[PDB]
From a paper:
It contains two predicted domains: an N-terminal domain of unknown function (14.5 kDa; DUF1842) and the C-terminal domain (DUF1843; 5.4 kDa), which tends to appear in multiple paralogous copies within individual bacterial operons. The N-terminal domain was predicted to fold into a β-barrel composed of eight antiparallel strands.
We were able to collect a complete data set from a single crystal, which could be processed in space group P212121. We refer to this crystal as form 3, since its unit-cell dimensions were distinct from those of forms 1 and 2. The form 3 model had an R factor of 27.3% and an R free of 33.3%. The backbone r.m.s.d. values between the experimental structures and the AlphaFold model were 0.35 Å for form 1, 0.49 Å for form 2 and 0.46 Å for form 3. As a result, no biologically relevant interfaces could be inferred with confidence. One potentially relevant exception is that the form 2 noncrystallographic interface is present as a crystallographic interface in the form 3 crystals.
Numbering used by the authors: 5 to 67, 78 to 135
Write the structure that this text describes.
Amino acid sequence: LRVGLFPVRYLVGTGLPGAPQLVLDLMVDTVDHSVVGRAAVSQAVSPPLNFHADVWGSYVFRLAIVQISLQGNQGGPQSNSMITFYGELLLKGDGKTGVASYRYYSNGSWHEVENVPVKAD
């Protein structure tokens, strides 16, 4: 428990049956402005979409928005694997709600999810 770190969990998605769902488990170091964690994308479709990536990035606060930029792959930033994930979270100033877009790589192609709600915990 260093002073500048706290965790946060984000629920990203419309929440509609069959819509894509992203859960981000992030650790936030408020010193370096850095973010690290895991992204899990699922979808209750046939067949099922079960995308996962180790993610890292940073955040920027703009007056009140908190913008979180993420990219991800299999293994983290020290892995030399290709990035299979991009995400951008625009939280409202309270840091509990906002909008997000992301891209993940699956079946030899990229898939983009744009402007979906975000919730904390």
